[PDB]
Amino acid sequence: KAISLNKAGKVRGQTPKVEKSEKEKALTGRAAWRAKFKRRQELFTGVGKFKFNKQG
RNA sequence: CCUUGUUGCUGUGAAGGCUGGCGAAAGCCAGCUGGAGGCGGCAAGCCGUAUUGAUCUGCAAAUCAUUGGCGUAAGCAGGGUA
RNA sequence: UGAACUCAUUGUGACAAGGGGAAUCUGACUGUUUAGUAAAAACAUAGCUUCAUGAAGAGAGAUGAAGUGAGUUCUGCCCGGU
RNA sequence: CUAUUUAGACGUAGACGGGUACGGGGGAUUAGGGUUUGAUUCCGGAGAGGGAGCCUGAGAGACGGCUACCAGGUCCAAGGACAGCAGCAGGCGCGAAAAUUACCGAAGCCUCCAAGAGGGCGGUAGUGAAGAGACGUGAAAACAAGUGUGUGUAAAAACCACAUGAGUAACUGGAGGUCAAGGCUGGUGCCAGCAUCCGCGGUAAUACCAGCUCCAGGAGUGUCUAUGAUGAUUGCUGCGAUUAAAAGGUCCGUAGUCGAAGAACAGUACUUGUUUGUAAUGUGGCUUAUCGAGAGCCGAAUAGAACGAGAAGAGUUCAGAGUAAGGAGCGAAGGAGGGCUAGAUUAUUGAGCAGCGAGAGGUGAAAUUUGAUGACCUGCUUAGGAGUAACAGAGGCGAAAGCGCUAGUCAAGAACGAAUCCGAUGAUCAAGGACGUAGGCUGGAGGAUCGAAGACGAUUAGAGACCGUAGUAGUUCCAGCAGUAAACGAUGCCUACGCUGUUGUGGUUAUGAGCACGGCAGAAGAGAAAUCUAGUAGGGCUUUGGGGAGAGUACGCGCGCAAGCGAUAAAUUUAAAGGAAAUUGACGGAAGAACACCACAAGGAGUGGAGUGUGCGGCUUAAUUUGACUCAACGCGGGACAGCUUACCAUACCCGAUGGCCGUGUGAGCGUAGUACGCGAUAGGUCAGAGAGUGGUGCAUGGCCGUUAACGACGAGUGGGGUGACCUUUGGGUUAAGUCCGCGAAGUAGUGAGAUCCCUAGGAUACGAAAGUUAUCGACAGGUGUUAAAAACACAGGAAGGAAGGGGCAAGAACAGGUCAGUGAUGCCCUUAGAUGGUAUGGGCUGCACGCGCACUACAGUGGUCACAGCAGAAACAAAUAGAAGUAAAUGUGAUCGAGAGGGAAUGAGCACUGUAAUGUGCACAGGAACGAGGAAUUGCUAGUAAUCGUUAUCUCAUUAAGAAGCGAUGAAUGUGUCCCUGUUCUUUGUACACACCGCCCGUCGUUAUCGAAGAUGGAACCAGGUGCGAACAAGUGAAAGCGAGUGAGUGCAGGGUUCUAGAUCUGAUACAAGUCGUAACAAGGCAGCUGUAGGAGAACCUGUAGCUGGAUCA
């Protein structure tokens, strides 16, 4: 029974190209760690609930 | 059908037997002894495959040479008888 | 059965004396046949199967008639015609 | 190595052959016990393209020495010459795979005749994210990498010191679960892709493709491939074998592994001391480079060996010792244990003869078939070959397979009783040996019954099968071969420790009990449960399993006359497996209780047959619009259609939210006796996008209905049992109803029923003066009779008597039940000015060869006709001279008619009514069809019921009832039961179904792919041997010429041993979305299934014979 290869690549053609927006140089090493440690202060409490990423 | 004549040399090695080993048994393995067979190679013989040889006014109204098949046997043969 | 020495082509010295292997068709084997153009795959053979008979100087492990062809393995279906 | 003598040497504790390998010190992982690796700094071995010979030397069978062959090369003037990077750089190939044709009088060492010469050995840098350390990528005031001097070195660079500039510096994999972190926004619509595994995507994708935010590790992070761990899935420590994979059919037996008490003895294992035995690595430490890997120094150490010591266990010996270890023997007794000899009561067939005179046989029902040549049945005679009924059992015997009549005879064994004898003789078992139901095979004997194959008769779409008739090999015996079973208690053999009650068999007994071999019922433990040959446990020895498939198959080998059997692989494929047991449903062609005139039995009236009225299918037509199909479609869709209804056909006529773009008072359109007159923007073409439809899909839905069912079921706490899915427990009586009464590891409250309305029947003491109306009352099985309780009848009184009668309301769960043509209830698809939207005039829905469902008049006399009366539920009625809607009718009295004067179907010329229109209805006169009580079947109904008779101021309705829904008149007949039919509920029952029987599933045939066997004829390579021939070198002998043992490379010719590969054709397996033919298995799966063996067959499979329950029976 018939088979064909006519459709290879389809979705990569049809998805509209969007440009990457600019951003700062991010931290690295201990610098990144001081930044994370201040954000997560709630979580280091044994009560209440932190949430890393929410879209509401 | 009755009465007779005619088996020399060699190979292979069945049945039966004796020793030695192995095995709990049953019975297995060696070496020797024995000498069966419409069994092998030949002789005397009996036959007739090839050369499509010789001969074809023949040696001969069926022969000759070399080459072949069987040869311890449903083998070959004289006389008497049907 | 060994060993040594010896020879100018080497030694079953003349005579006598197997060529061998791989496959296929066919008949089991030894045996027989067209005297005088055919020796064969043809005939025979052991074994297998069928048939008829209580008659005998013979008495069913008998006496005659046919077909197939040792051994192994198989031998299906049809009694309308003759 | 050679001469003569002796036959040895080595093997199941694995010889010999083949395959594979540099060996250790050490490395990786690791709680422990282990599993894997070692070309690779140290030690020892071998080699220099492949083989072989050799001179020199203290030392080489040397290759940066020589000589010859074989395979390859280089230069030439063609005559000859040279050469070997598994040294250091470097090049080409091969591969998925690995650096510079660099500097060196310095460090560590080696070489010479040396106050010096040589060394790619060694050192120094360059190159590369194989590995391992320490740190940058900012701080809150103030941060690498640069540069210059000095150092450093053999010379350098880097490193470090001081001094100058300054302000540079993160990516890889992810975000549904395992597994840390987004239902974010846009594309795509089972596509494209993602995903180790599970799984995502069919237009609402937290999983694809991207954007944006988060997470993890970070100068690093992902992937592929080997291995160690995960893993008690290789089990010494430490798994399993009743049913999941797994105990050999039973014995004997060698090698092997394992083996009393008592008294003594000896030191080789065993354990331990002292001394040896380890550079690096590793282990326990300390000291110096800024720190940390690194470097330097210290201490102890494995296996292996030398010499002493201790004697528990192991070992050796002894007999004034004699196992709930074995063998020999004695006494009395028991048993379908085995071989042989001689007898037996019946039965089934066959023949003979006699009696009798028509059928016998076989089945669910029948046909083949046999009988007047006398069957069948009943007598008497006989001839054979099998078998041992009932007694006969959770009884006995045997190693298992197996063994059942009675006597006699011949060997051996088990158990029991007891002061017999010998003394370790024993347990288990590769190899080897003996037995083994049935079916089968080789030869003989025989042949009653039964019966594979083969042949018929039936049944079926087809039966080749199941059933019946018949019939052969076999089924029996003797002498052998064979070697398998669901050969199963699916539970190896010895030996232990272990609770109670009961019942057997054989001996013995202080009569209390024991010993051997059993059955049964609990308990406690155990186990995933079911259950227990399964409890406790490092006792000994053998067999044996490691996810499904392919496969107990291929090749080789051993046995067999054959049939075959024993033993046993790879390639390939796949996420689970009809894997195990237990829980809830659905299903069955099961079993057991119940119940009911919408079930039946015993009783009433009909339907099915005629004509007509009406609905359904079929056909016709321009159109005859359409839903619904077992109960639970068919006078049903409130479906009595002239128009309307109306969805269909013919002709004709009529009709548009908004927004953008394009035009307009010089007129964008409209009215008309329509073209010249009247009115004017209002309402104008095209793209988007809205808002009709009796158009489609009820398998996209809501609501409402119908049906299960008008049935007894049905949720909550707390409590008991089970690991849990789950059950609340023994099913005995009653009602319409788990409605109730008993009893319980259960007990307490609720829904449903019931109770709770409304109508109909009786009732003033209330109200009225009109004469009726309404009523909180009245009935409870209360009374009597029936001797547990719960109910019950039968009487009696009573207006009403066992749910007073009749309605009405009415659990949970269900169904792919009906309706989109009821709905401004509704998703999605379709049409939409030449409409699938409205309207009008007509035509159809009403056509007519024909099959069906439900009604109406009938078939007369228990009638027809004439007159006259007279009565309902209650109360409604211009007039009418033949006649043209209305206040009962059956019925009561008198006449009449007399067995087609019953009956009114098709049809004629008329006379009126309703209506917009007759085609519809009424009236008068004719006319006068079938039908003379209905085949197979089939439907309700228990009392003011059924049937009869009218009537509707009820519904449809201008006019049309032969339809429903009421209402009254006249008024019966039969049981008082049952589970047989027909159904419906509950409890036990089986399962490979859960998507739930419309389920699931087997095998041929045909088409594709992929991997493997065989096969006439064949190819490589690569090893060792056997024969030829023989280059180089050569001891010896010779003045010399020569001659030449021996060591041998290469190469002839035959063979073998290994590994690959070709091959016409045949034959397996696996995957085939769904192709063709059947339906073999799973329910009693429609003939219960399965194992062995033998025939047969399109194919699953079918048939004989023995076996098993994993069966549909613990009886």
Side-chain angles (χ1 to χ4, degrees), chain A residues 1-2 4 10 16-17 20-21 25-26 29-30 32 40 44 46 48 50 55:
Chain A
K1 181 175 183 181
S4 189
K10 197 180 90 169
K17 288 174 182 179
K20 294 191 84 72
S21 59
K25 295 286 181 180
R30 63 155 171 80
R40 293 169 186 188
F44 296 110
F50 185 64
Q55 268 55 56

Side-chain angles (χ1 to χ4, degrees), chain A residues 39 51-56:
Chain A
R39 186 178 183 258
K51 188 171 180 72
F52 294 82
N53 175 34
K54 200 190 184 177
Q55 268 55 56

Side-chain angles (χ1 to χ4, degrees), chain A residues 18-55:
Chain A
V18 172
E19 285 289 328
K20 294 191 84 72
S21 59
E22 70 167 34
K23 286 184 284 292
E24 311 92 330
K25 295 286 181 180
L27 303 179
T28 56
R30 63 155 171 80
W33 276 107
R34 201 206 297 183
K36 276 148 61 178
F37 180 68
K38 294 191 178 187
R39 186 178 183 258
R40 293 169 186 188
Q41 284 297 297
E42 289 181 292
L43 182 58
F44 296 110
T45 324
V47 296
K49 287 185 175 74
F50 185 64
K51 188 171 180 72
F52 294 82
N53 175 34
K54 200 190 184 177
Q55 268 55 56

Side-chain angles (χ1 to χ4, degrees), chain A residues 3-21:
Chain A
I3 296 290
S4 189
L5 304 182
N6 301 133
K7 293 174 182 179
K10 197 180 90 169
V11 72
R12 180 177 298 278
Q14 299 199 125
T15 61
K17 288 174 182 179
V18 172
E19 285 289 328
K20 294 191 84 72
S21 59

